[PDB]
Design a protein around this ligand. Structure first.
Ligand SMILES: [Zn+2]
Ligand SMILES: [Zn+2]
Ligand SMILES: [Zn+2]
Lengths: 153, 153
């Protein structure tokens, strides 16, 4: 089994730890952990292309999209590899993250190791929004916290 | 070419940006950038195995050592893949980093993407120090700053 880990940090109150586990090379990736300091509601949750934090989360670039697809939700065929949908925060400002995804990987051309995980200001509309930006970013707003996805023990 | 980047952060502030560039997978990696907030003298400079900064630089584990070798300097045949020797800080507290290395890579089994770059408290004795610790850590002492090595544009 392969494992990875990401420490989310930013300029404000948002911080988290996210774990990745892939039992088999061809298999789904379990994503789990916790994020604190979030407003109640949905927050866009994406793997962005670059593991570049030189200028904070802006340097991470666009959604990781090795197959040149449009933006969607994790359960859509038409999605970026990086499209992990939304995490949900309650009034406690905590999002408990528990995802299984078949499109990201910890090896090969879908590999997310060395790329950046970002949690966003607003909801990702999963490409179903009423504008052009829906099909590109999902209108999830600014980047609250991010980290480079690293190889774990 | 393949490129990677690492933001070093630690108490001080010890703060640096280190760039990696590899023209070809069978070629050397150029490593360059700047680190500020260091004491004058040599500081051990290593790639550690895990890109895990969960509990700070300690979570990164030992020197990256995929070939099960002993610790050495970058010029030694007998070294860990992660053994990049020392960076030198002047009285200005700045280390200007300019390294070329044939053993690290940005792809394959010696790939350092998703691992942690660490700058150390003391000099790495390059395995010539003559105690047991020399052949394992190089006696470079505590971890001042670290970051996960990410894929760059
Ligand atoms: Zn995003
Ligand atoms: Zn997307
Ligand atoms: Zn070593």
């Amino acid at each position: 089994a392969t494992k990875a880990v990401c420490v989310l940090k930013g300029d404000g109150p948002v911080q988290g730890i996210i774990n990745f586990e892939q039992k088999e090379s061809n298999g789904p990736v379990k994503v789990w952990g916790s994020i604190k300091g979030l407003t109640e509601g949905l927050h866009g949750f994406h793997v962005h292309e670059f593991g570049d934090n030189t200028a904070g989360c802006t340097s991470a670039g666009p959604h990781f999209n090795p197959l040149s697809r449009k933006h969607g939700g994790p359960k859509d065929e038409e999605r970026h590899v990086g499209d992990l949908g939304n995490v949900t925060a309650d009034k406690d400002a905590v999002a408990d993250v528990s995802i299984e995804d078949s499109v990201i990987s910890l090896s090969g051309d879908h590999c997310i190791i060395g790329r950046t995980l970002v949690v966003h200001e607003k909801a990702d509309d999963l490409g179903k929004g009423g504008n052009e930006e829906s099909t590109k970013t999902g209108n999830a707003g600014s980047r609250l916290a991010c980290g480079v996805i690293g190889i774990a023990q």
